[PDB]
């Protein structure tokens, strides 16, 4: 084993020069530049709605693009679509497998996708000539549990799995179109760029990668976390994203400078982060925690600006509407709350 | 109230019907007993699951005994890290762990040094002292008993346990194995281990599982009236 050592050394020097270039491009910091911006005042947002009806832990939720309807998944083998203005239940969909841990809502509003420990992504048609919701397709390519899934349009969907890979599917034929294999740990989350041309994934190897949908190659790899990355989300501008890991911190990366910008942590914070989301203009950075709470962060100066404290168990998922009017939180205590 | 339109009233009625269906399903699903089957590949889970019950992902097995319904989930096909999905199974009534007695001399194929029974003991140690399973009882099965009785004639137990000081009798070596597994438990005050030796036993396994489950359910019923 001699040539393998040469390859390892060449990779090591490649990483060294990459880090040298990143240091060359790291003269200033976001904290240094934003030192003279007036802070946003204390944020007091209160519970407007409580959605009841799930009889087990909520694992995922997702907003519709109309900012009124949302879908949530639970371990009791049910998938419920809610009307958030009225708290009326629109549909209740029983699943073949109750070990669900992800759900998604199509931007068109026509489909809902969920998957979990059965290693299958299922698509449901909501708008049929009959009155009921029926399964329209099952995608059975992955060899590990489904951890996240996001629609691109009515015919394409991207999924992440515990077999260290992401894939892109064709709904009508049902076949994998592309495979993304760079990761060396379980992929736990993904986020789509607002124009649906790139996307980022976070894996249990404490790294995040940026993938091109068309070619199917990893352009950039980001590091810095000391533990598993559980959540990921793009900045609305499209040139930055935030990650929340098990080391109790959030971090922000930019694509153009190809490195970390700023860290969000506090001494009193010890638990892991389950979910992360941005506000409509990107000024606020919401994050769900294991300590039963939710923190609101000023994304430009890394100081806490509020707390959402109403859940009796772990905050498992959260999302912000497209119009920026409300925040939804789901928890292991089986309740969904709409904050505003 | 009376500020709602006709279509709004009909949507409210639809929501009420969905709510009653959800409650009915919840009560139907609250009756069943759900178990989590574990253990290594060569442990003997196949005979176990095919004698209570008479491509990848979770496998669910449904059987019945004395008008009590059972559901047993096998997660042997999940080659992912246990820590990211094991918390899905907090709240199971009990955990069934299968071990093969006849592998006290065989070694794992992946590594020569790591002895197979020691691998089973390490998996048991990891599962027992996990923060999601503090108060979950464990039904421990020792399977290849007849092969153990046949193989201890010429294979000393010192091949696996260097400090063993007993004999070639089956019963005393079996007791030593049971003590080795039952002493990996560190809680010792909130959960119990139910060990049972079965090689070709019929309908004894189902009865043993039923008794352990009834004990667990009694101790859980004592946790709603405050008497515990």
């Amino acid at each position, epitope marked *: 084993q001699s040539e393998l050592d040469q390859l390892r050394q060449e990779a090591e020097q490649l990483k060294n020069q990459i880090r040298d270039a990143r240091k060359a491009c790291a003269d200033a910091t976001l904290s240094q530049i934003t030192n003279n911006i007036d802070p946003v005042g204390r944020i007091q947002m209160r519970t407007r709605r409580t959605l009841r009806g799930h009889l087990a832990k909520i694992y995922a939720m997702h907003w519709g693009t109309d900012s009124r309807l949302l879908v949530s998944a639970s371990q009791d083998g049910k998938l419920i679509i809610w009307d958030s203005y009225t708290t009326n239940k629109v549909h209740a969909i029983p699943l073949r497998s109750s070990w669900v841990m992800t759900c998604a809502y199509a931007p068109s509003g026509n489909y809902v996708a969920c998957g979990g420990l059965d290693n299958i992504c299922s698509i449901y048609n909501l708008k049929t000539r*009959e009155g009921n919701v029926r399964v329209s397709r099952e995608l059975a390519g992955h060899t590990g549990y489904l951890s996240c899934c996001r629609f691109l349009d009515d015919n394409q969907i991207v999924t992440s799995s515990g077999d260290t890979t992401c894939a892109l599917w064709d709904i009508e034929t049902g076949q994998q179109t592309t495979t993304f294999t760079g990761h060396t740990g379980d992929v736990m989350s993904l986020s789509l760029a607002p124009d649906t041309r790139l996307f980022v994934s976070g894996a249990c190897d404490a790294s995040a990668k940026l993938w091109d949908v068309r070619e199917g190659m990893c352009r950039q790899t980001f590091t810095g976390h000391e533990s598993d990355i559980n959540a990921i989300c793009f900045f609305p501008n499209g040139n930055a994203f935030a990650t929340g890991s098990d080391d109790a911190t959030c971090r922000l990366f930019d694509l153009r400078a190809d490195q970390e910008l700023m860290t969000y942590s506090h001494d009193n914070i010890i638990c892991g982060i389950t979910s992360v989301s941005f506000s409509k203009s990107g000024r606020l950075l919401l994050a769900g925690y294991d300590d039963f709470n939710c923190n609101v962060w000023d994304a430009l100066k890394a100081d806490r600006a509020g707390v959402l404290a109403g859940h009796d168990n772990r905050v498992s998922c959260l999302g912000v509407t497209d119009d920026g009017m409300a925040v939804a939180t789901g928890s292991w205590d089986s309740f969904l709350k709409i904050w505003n | 109230g009376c500020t709602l*339109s006709a279509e709004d009233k009909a949507a409210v009625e639809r929501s009420k019907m969905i709510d009653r269906n959800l409650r009915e399903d919840g009560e139907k699903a609250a009756r069943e007993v759900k178990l989590l089957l574990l253990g290594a590949g060569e442990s003997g889970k196949n005979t176990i699951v095919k004698q209570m019950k008479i491509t990848t992902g979770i496998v669910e097995t449904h059987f019945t005994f004395k008008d009590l319904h059972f559901k047993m989930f096998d997660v042997g096909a999940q080659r992912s890290e246990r820590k990211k999905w094991i918390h899905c199974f907090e709240g199971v009534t009990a955990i069934i762990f299968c071990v093969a007695l006849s592998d006290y001399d065989l070694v794992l194929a992946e590594d020569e040094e790591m002895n197979r029974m020691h691998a089973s003991m390490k998996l048991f140690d990891s599962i027992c002292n996990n923060k999601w399973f503090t108060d979950t009882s464990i039904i421990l099965f020792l399977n290849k008993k007849d092969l153990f009785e046949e193989k201890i004639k010429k294979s000393p137990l010192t091949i696996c346990y260097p400090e063993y000081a007993g004999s070639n009798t089956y019963e005393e070596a079996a007791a030593y194995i049971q003590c080795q597994f039952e002493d990996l438990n560190k809680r010792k005050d909130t959960k119990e281990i139910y060990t049972h030796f079965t090689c070709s036993t019929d309908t004894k396994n189902v009865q043993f599982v039923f008794d352990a489950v009834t004990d667990v359910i009694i101790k859980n019923n004592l946790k709603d009236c405050g008497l515990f």
Partner: single-chain antibody
Amino acid sequence: MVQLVESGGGLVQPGGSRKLSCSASGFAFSSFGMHWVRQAPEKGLEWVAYISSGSGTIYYADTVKGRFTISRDDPKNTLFLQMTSLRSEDTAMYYCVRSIYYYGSSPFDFWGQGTTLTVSSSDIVMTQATSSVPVTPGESVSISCRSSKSLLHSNGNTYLYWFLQRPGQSPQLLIYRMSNLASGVPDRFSGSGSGTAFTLTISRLEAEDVGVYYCMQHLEYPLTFGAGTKLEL
């Protein structure tokens, strides 16, 4: 596919009872509410009765309340209308209409091919000004309807529906809630209005879509139709 078939009808003498049933096939019957709508010979539509999903809510029109009774047999997928003490003005062709109510749904989306019963020997009023409009293919026509009370609601919904009945066919939904085009309807019809005045626009008129157009309100029970305007070549 989706099908609704009614049975019964025939000749009945005054004061005698008769029973109508409708058989459904091809959709989830128990999730839908159902209506009965009758059409007198050479007249317009007139709502009759309604039963909700789960039979929790029942409404009748004043002209038939106390005489008719409506029920549904969910296991057998059948809707019933038991009529008692029929009157000479009960001669009509009865239709069965399915409707489902949730956010974003389109009620009145399927009308069964009706059955005929002939007998031997305040409420919002909807008005449509014209009654006969000569038309040429390729041009544009503007059917107009007007309501006595505003159909706009506090939540922002305008509860106006448009139906088309071609010669010899059952009525078909075109526009629901005054602006939303129906599923299979070609992108040639448009809905507009504000509060109490409403209009329906047709561009590039063709041969198949000549007939009678009705406006309907769904703000309060009972439901009321307008007098249809006939487009004639």
